Symmetry: D2
């Protein structure tokens, strides 16, 4: 199995109250759904990503990332967010991320297409 | 089909000489391989991502993102990059992105875990 | 007198244990020193920046930013960090930032020149 | 004098048509004005920043950064941009930057407070 396949798989919550449900595959795949508590979003959206399935054994975290395009059967916000971060295991497991949210824009507005932020996910709350 | 399924699917090159080979699915999926011309990387890596399969019809671009974890059969750089951006169609089609590259780190180096940059992909190298 | 001139001026600490000493001028200037608890840094470095001296009155925060170039009489890390963020007043006043740390690099390494992160500053600890 | 004091001082233009007028001081100071061709901006705004006044001699660029708060006598966009980057000298001198644009927001919208982008400045056009 991947080293943190079991630790990453499951339900995660971030500081905004969003819910990140993910399955880690033994080869590096991430698949799941994301539900945002904020923004132009309702219900669940497909996500897909990748993770390092053989991380360093020196106490380092486990690099990973995933993408949501904000289109589902309810809404289309013409945008996509990618989260890039690392998983840290243990009693208070965390996924610490930074993210890039790009909107489809006209060429005149493309300088302002992308927001950046940071989300921390925990297995509780 | 996704509105830009045909325009996104194929081989792309960025300004560093990296090669991004992608298939866009009608529902929003992106799958393919990435080969970086720079960094701790050799040969192809799996990528997965998502795109807006029903973008605005007002001349706006098409939001999308994808992830590579930098582990393959040759190397493991204990890191993952996510690209977030928009596809702009037409005779000089482009995918304009910004990206976040996170390494697995110890908690002491985690403040320095993530680089940020920008890549532009075209259909011609 | 800037609206938050009095609230911003003083000593601030972030989650890494770094110390940010700043004076806010009535026109929008920020001047002070920064001492980082981490990285290739020792003792204090000059900082300068700007803040919105007439913020919105609707409960919004106060936008601001500043720069440190990591050269002083002790060390030169050939890099500079800019923090961009907002000040939020009140009993638990905070400056919430994201930052970009760029190193001087060769053109071959320039794709990897810049790290991104987030710091939260408070008046205590 | 700073090593690139003479090369940095002067008028610069980015890809959007904005105009950056700056004086570099021998100790590391940057002072000047910024005029944006885009966004909620009119005429010139104060800027201040810092640069590495003793960069590496191995052909590396020169790290620097600066801030604009988007308030002047004409408009107040309740926001600030910081540019972080490096100066590269020579016949086609360039300042290559990434930037963070933070607006003052309510706490409910703070997740969306910050845009990120990249500007390249040249001495011509
Ligand atoms: O909303 C969506 C889809 C849902 C995304 C959820 C994000 S994903 C990272 C995170 N993690 C989570 O769990 N949830 C959030 N797309 C469109 C975004 C357009 C950006 C528009 N505005 C923000 C804004 C919000 C409210 C009122 C006004 N303006 C950008 C902006 C930036 C700076 C200054 C001003 N405005
Ligand atoms: O290399 C990889 C896997 C490949 C990624 C390729 C990227 S993906 C975005 C892009 N698009 C492309 O096509 N290719 C590139 N991971 C490890 C990254 C560790 C970062 C270490 N150093 C950079 C460095 C380079 C050379 C010598 C020394 N240090 C970070 C850093 C930040 C600032 C200052 C100094 N160092
Ligand atoms: O250190 C300085 C001056 C001090 C800055 C302090 C920052 S300012 C934002 C913050 N807030 C604070 O208060 N303090 C910190 N410049 C040089 C930066 C070189 C980056 C090299 N490496 C990081 C690293 C650390 C340890 C061992 C190896 N490599 C980049 C990198 C990126 C990703 C993956 C790997 N490496
Ligand atoms: O404008 C200013 C002051 C001037 C700044 C100039 C920047 S400084 C980096 C650069 N370099 C330059 O030279 N010029 C630009 N502040 C307020 C920003 C509010 C953001 C609102 N919007 C963008 C937007 C524009 C038009 C219509 C709609 N939305 C954010 C957004 C983001 C993502 C998706 C959707 N909306
Ligand atoms: Fe907007
Ligand atoms: Fe490093
Ligand atoms: Fe490095
Ligand atoms: Fe907005
Ligand atoms: Fe908006």
């Amino acid at each position: 199995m991947g080293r943190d396949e079991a630790g990453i798989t499951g339900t995660w919550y971030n500081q905004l109250g969003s819910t990140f449900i993910v399955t880690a595959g033994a080869d590096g795949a991430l698949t799941g759904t994301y539900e945002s508590a904020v923004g132009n979003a309702e219900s669940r959206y497909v996500l897909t990503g990748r993770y390092d399935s053989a991380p360093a054994t020196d106490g380092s975290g486990t690099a990973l990332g995933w993408t949501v395009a904000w289109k589902n059967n309810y809404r289309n916000a013409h945008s996509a967010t990618t989260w890039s971060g690392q998983y840290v295991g243990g009693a208070q497991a965390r996924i610490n991320t930074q993210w890039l949210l790009t909107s489809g824009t006209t060429e005149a507005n493309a300088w302002a297409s992308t927001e950046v932020g940071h989300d921390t996910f925990t297995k509780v709350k």
